[PDB]
Design a protein around this ligand. Structure first.
Ligand SMILES: *[C@@H]1O[C@H](CO)[C@@H](O[C@@H]2O[C@H](CO)[C@@H](O)[C@H](O)[C@H]2NC(C)=O)[C@H](O)[C@H]1NC(C)=O
Ligand SMILES: *[C@@H]1O[C@H](CO)[C@@H](O[C@@H]2O[C@H](CO)[C@@H](O)[C@H](O)[C@H]2NC(C)=O)[C@H](O)[C@H]1NC(C)=O
Ligand SMILES: *[C@@H]1O[C@H](CO)[C@@H](O[C@@H]2O[C@H](CO)[C@@H](O)[C@H](O)[C@H]2NC(C)=O)[C@H](O)[C@H]1NC(C)=O
Ligand SMILES: *[C@@H]1O[C@H](CO)[C@@H](O[C@@H]2O[C@H](CO)[C@@H](O)[C@H](O)[C@H]2NC(C)=O)[C@H](O)[C@H]1NC(C)=O
Ligand SMILES: *[C@@H]1O[C@H](CO)[C@@H](O[C@@H]2O[C@H](CO)[C@@H](O)[C@H](O)[C@H]2NC(C)=O)[C@H](O)[C@H]1NC(C)=O
Ligand SMILES: *[C@@H]1O[C@H](CO)[C@@H](O)[C@H](O)[C@H]1NC(C)=O
Ligand SMILES: *[C@@H]1O[C@H](CO)[C@@H](O)[C@H](O)[C@H]1NC(C)=O
Ligand SMILES: *[C@@H]1O[C@H](CO)[C@@H](O)[C@H](O)[C@H]1NC(C)=O
Ligand SMILES: *[C@@H]1O[C@H](CO)[C@@H](O)[C@H](O)[C@H]1NC(C)=O
Lengths: 197, 173, 344, 98
């Protein structure tokens, strides 16, 4: 997937392109006249006397200084975006690589298992490994079992039934077990819970 | 008008000037109305256009066909349109000319706005369409039935984050 | 009278420390609270040439000496406009399946009629969503104004006409209100029918009381509490929702954060319109007076002064708009995190 | 071509580019002035028999007349003609109130 798609790392190319454009913008802005008789400082000094050269030079100084201030402000805002991104990347490093997080989609879509960070130009690429449910089946359920008049609830999992028999399964994986006293607890009685089998 | 120049559209005004007032001015300190110096009528003056033009362009390495969106032109209700040539599709974002209107929703490529998007499709042309938000699906609500996974898969996905950018120093002198 | 006082930080309380005694809850309540986050802001584009020059050829020719600044400001505003749609999709584009709303609105005693969309209204919004839309006031009655109406004198001096005449264009969002309501409805149907399974992947149907039982187990309370008191829990839930509807309807400031975002952008654009009128040191704020009374070289001096004034005004606007955009991006990222982490 | 020019490129990538505005141009020139037919009294001002002493200078209002400064070119040679409020070349395009 990475080898095939030329745009796989487009975000990083965009960061590089934004800084390249900002510097080419300063180079091109250097050539503006800014209201002066000439964009070239040496022409002003060569053809004009001191006080007239000073007026045209002051116009060019204002122009270039305003250009640099605009550049610095935009560069600083982009730096702020990079800081936010870096803080997120560091959080992902500690939370997804050095552990296992419960947050949905935080470490990729699906249930998080593990991750492997990799280096990248001006950035980081995380490979997230997740557990994803696949084939599934439709089963009948019930909230409780009424064995002897007491209410029996599962200790873990869910009560599942095929066409003829009831079992206990894990919510994320179908391994039917026999319903027993070692995986079921008792609380209350059969007259409160709705739909008891 | 009496030495006050400009460009715009003159209309009859609903304003009344005081006996000594000659000109009306807007909040921008520009002329909004004038008392005509030849006949003492009050006239309003409005700029001739709002513009609002953008061009939908496929990449030039494939085709040179383009379509133009006019943000403030109501092509259904001249029309402040550069050229037409049929293929006029009005949207909430304004009317556009040059793309075909197809009512088969699809995946968005070049966004236009207000629910409308466009792409270049093959007899090649630019196609304008309503965006498809996603596939439709449903899930039954059954108070006595659950679904349980019987199999599973390991899925590997990627996440990309910037960490740093080129450090630049400038000698301002 | 006006009363000055020392602030009360909170009510005083205490809790005994007893090495042989604990407190244990004997009863519980379902509580419903709200959280409000900005996701997007009005997208604005500015034609820096129409703003600076009143269709004056001489002004335009002078502007070309600074043209790259005009182009750069246009590019920055375009980038902001693009980010607003990216943020909107990230908050509202986590699920690519659109689930139908079940015909049943009451599941196990839990009443969702105020949450799910009402199919009988032109706007597929819930009563609560409808109230949310009826609290935020938007000056722009859509995005198409046309050339008519604004051609004549507007007695109210409708600001959108003046703003468009000066080159300030309000852009439509990429996603419409109907699309957002439809997406959100799909998320509600998803969670109600399948709990959190549709977030991770396929949507697995689970009876609603069992989703609640699993959620209680997540809290650290046995499923028995939910099944023993299911009717009481459903009644408290339904009452809490009714309280939310009354709280939102009653309080005019419930959505103040969103009104503040709208007001900040409206003020920024009215500020540009008012700043257009400044003299900036020139003999006149109106370009046509300078051209009419002065010869070329004197007009060029006064025009250059006005160009500097207007260009500085636009740069200030763009910088402030970009910083606000940064705040919106931070808010949108938080909203997307809350969507994935709290809803799915 | 407008987009190609805007981006300073002969290749344009897929997307939407905003390119200035559609502007309506004026088709005619409409000029309106009051119907003033009298010529201003330039003779009385410049061909006066006597001028008042500077210590007791005179002033009079001029109204309801047309100003034309080309009439003086073959009347007298002036050593000073300096305008501060308006450039001389624009004097014929204005109308004055006091
Ligand atoms: C539900 O599952 C049970 C347990 O596997 C099935 O019952 C068993 O069926 C096999 C034959 O396939 C018998 O040898 C076992 O003795 C049965 N067990 C019991 C406890 O009776 C049952 O057939 C399945 N029902 C359906 C409808 O598929
Ligand atoms: C589980 O049962 C539901 C019905 O309760 C199945 O959904 C139906 O699937 C058929 C196609 O097989 C569609 O034509 C129906 O419109 C669906 N009905 C619904 C959603 O109410 C679902 O496919 C079954 N799933 C499994 C894994 O057996
Ligand atoms: C649990 O016991 C504490 C005392 O250990 C109670 O706190 C006292 O409450 C009375 C009012 O009933 C106050 O006058 C005392 O000053 C409190 N003493 C403290 C905090 O040391 C507490 O109310 C009891 N709670 C319950 C639920 O019975
Ligand atoms: C679910 O809630 C809705 C309101 O959201 C209930 O509908 C209301 O019912 C009362 C009568 O009990 C009417 O006076 C209201 O006008 C109804 N409101 C609306 C908006 O329809 C509905 O009855 C509730 N259902 C259940 C089963 O409790
Ligand atoms: C637990 O608190 C709930 C309220 O949160 C109590 O339920 C209410 O009790 C009053 C009597 O004090 C009744 O009038 C209300 O109709 C009840 N509400 C509901 C929704 O049933 C409950 O009695 C408290 N005690 C427990 C659960 O033991
Ligand atoms: C389940 O819902 C059906 C209606 O579809 C109802 O008749 C039945 O009694 C309900 N059963 C339980 C256990 O809630
Ligand atoms: C055009 O004007 C009509 C009549 O006001 C209106 O119904 C319609 O929505 C407007 N715009 C478009 C794009 O059709
Ligand atoms: C000249 O102007 C006056 C003042 O407005 C007006 O009453 C008169 O009719 C005009 N006459 C002509 C011939 O235009
Ligand atoms: C002054 O008189 C001369 C003739 O001596 C005449 O040519 C000139 O036009 C008069 N000037 C004015 C201002 O009328």
């Amino acid at each position: 997937s990475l080898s095939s798609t030329p745009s796989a790392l487009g975000k990083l190319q965009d960061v590089v392109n934004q800084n390249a454009q900002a510097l080419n913008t300063l180079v091109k802005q250097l050539s503006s006249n800014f209201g002066a008789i000439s964009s070239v400082l040496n022409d002003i000094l060569s053809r004009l006397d001191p006080p007239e050269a000073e007026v045209q030079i002051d116009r060019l100084i204002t122009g270039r200084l305003q250009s640099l201030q605009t550049y610095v402000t935009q560069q600083l805002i982009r730096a702020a975006e990079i800081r936010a991104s870096a803080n997120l990347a560091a959080t992902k490093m500690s939370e997804c690589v050095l552990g296992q997080s419960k947050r949905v989609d935080f470490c990729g879509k699906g249930y998080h298992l593990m991750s492997f960070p990799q280096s990248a130009p001006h950035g980081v690429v995380f490979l997230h490994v997740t557990y994803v449910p696949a084939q599934e089946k439709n089963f009948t359920t019930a909230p409780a079992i009424c064995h002897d008049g007491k209410a029996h609830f599962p200790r873990e999992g869910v009560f599942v039934s095929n066409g003829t028999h009831w079992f206990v399964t894990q919510r994320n994986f179908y391994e039917p077990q026999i319903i027993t006293t070692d995986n079921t607890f008792v609380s209350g009685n059969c007259d409160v819970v709705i739909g008891i089998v | 008008f009496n030495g006050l120049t400009g460009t715009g559209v003159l209309t009859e005004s609903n304003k009344k000037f005081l006996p000594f007032q000659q000109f009306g001015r807007d909040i921008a300190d520009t002329t909004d109305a004038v008392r005509d110096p030849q006949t003492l009528e009050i006239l309003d003056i409005t700029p001739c256009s709002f513009g609002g033009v953008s061009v939908i362009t496929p990449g030039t390495n494939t085709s040179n066909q383009v379509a133009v969106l006019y943000q403030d032109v109501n092509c259904t209700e001249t029309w402040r349109v550069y050229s037409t040539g049929s293929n006029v599709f009005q949207t909430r974002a304004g009317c556009l000319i040059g793309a075909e209107h197809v009512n088969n929703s699809y995946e968005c490529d070049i966004p236009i706005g207000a629910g409308i998007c466009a792409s270049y499709q093959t007899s090649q042309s630019i196609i304008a369409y309503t965006m498809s938000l996603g596939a439709e699906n449903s899930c039954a609500y059954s108070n006595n039935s659950i679904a349980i996974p019987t199999n599973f898969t390991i899925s590997v996905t990627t996440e990309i984050l910037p960490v740093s950018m080129t450090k630049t120093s400038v000698d301002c002198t | 009278s006006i009363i000055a006082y020392t602030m009360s930080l909170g009510a005083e309380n205490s809790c005994a420390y007893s090495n042989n005694s604990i407190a244990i809850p004997t009863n519980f309540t379902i509580s419903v609270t709200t959280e409000i986050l900005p996701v997007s802001m009005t997208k604005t584009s500015v034609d820096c040439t129409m703003y600076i020059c009143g269709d004056s050829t001489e002004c335009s020719n002078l502007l070309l000496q600074y043209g790259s600044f005009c182009t750069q400001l246009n590019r920055a505003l375009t980038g902001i406009a693009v980010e607003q749609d990216k943020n909107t999709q990230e908050v509202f584009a986590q699920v690519k399946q659109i689930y139908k709303t079940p015909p049943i609105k009451d599941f196990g005693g839990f009443n969702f009629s105020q949450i799910l969309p009402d199919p009988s209204k032109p706007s597929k919004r819930s009563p609560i969503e409808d109230l949310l839309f009826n609290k935020v006031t938007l000056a722009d009655a859509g995005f198409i104004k046309q050339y008519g109406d604004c051609l004549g004198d507007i007695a109210a001096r409708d600001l959108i006409c003046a703003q468009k005449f000066n080159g300030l264009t309000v852009l439509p969002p990429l996603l419409t209100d109907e699309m957002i309501a439809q997406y959100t409805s799909a998320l509600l149907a998803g969670t109600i029918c399948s709990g959190w399974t549709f977030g991770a992947g396929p949507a697995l149907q689970i009876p609603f009381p069992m989703q609640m039982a699993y959620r209680f187990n997540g809290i650290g309370v046995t499923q028995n509490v939910l099944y023993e008191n299911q009717k009481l829990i459903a009644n408290q839930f339904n009452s809490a929702i009714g309280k939310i509807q009354d709280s939102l309807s009653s309080t005019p400031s419930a959505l103040g954060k969103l009104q503040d975002v709208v007001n900040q952008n409206a003020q920024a654009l009215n500020t540009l319109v008012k700043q257009l009128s400044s003299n900036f040191g020139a003999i006149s704020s109106v370009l046509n007076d300078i051209l009419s009374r002065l010869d070329p070289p004197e007009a060029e001096v006064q025009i250059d002064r006005l160009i500097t004034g207007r260009l500085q005004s636009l740069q200030t606007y763009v910088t402030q708009q970009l910083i606000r955009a940064a705040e919106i991006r931070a808010s949108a990222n938080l909203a997307a995190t809350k969507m994935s982490e709290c809803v799915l | 071509s407008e987009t190609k020019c805007t981006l300073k490129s002969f290749t344009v990538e897929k997307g939407i580019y905003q390119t200035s505005n559609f502007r309506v141009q004026p088709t005619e020139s409409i000029v309106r002035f009051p119907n003033i037919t009298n010529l201003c009294p330039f003779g009385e001002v410049f061909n006066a028999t006597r001028f008042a002493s500077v210590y007791a200078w005179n002033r009079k209002r001029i109204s309801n007349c047309v100003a034309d400064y080309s009439v003086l070119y073959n009347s007298a040679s002036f050593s000073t003609f300096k305008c501060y409020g308006v450039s001389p070349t624009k004097l014929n395009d204005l109308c004055f109130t006091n």
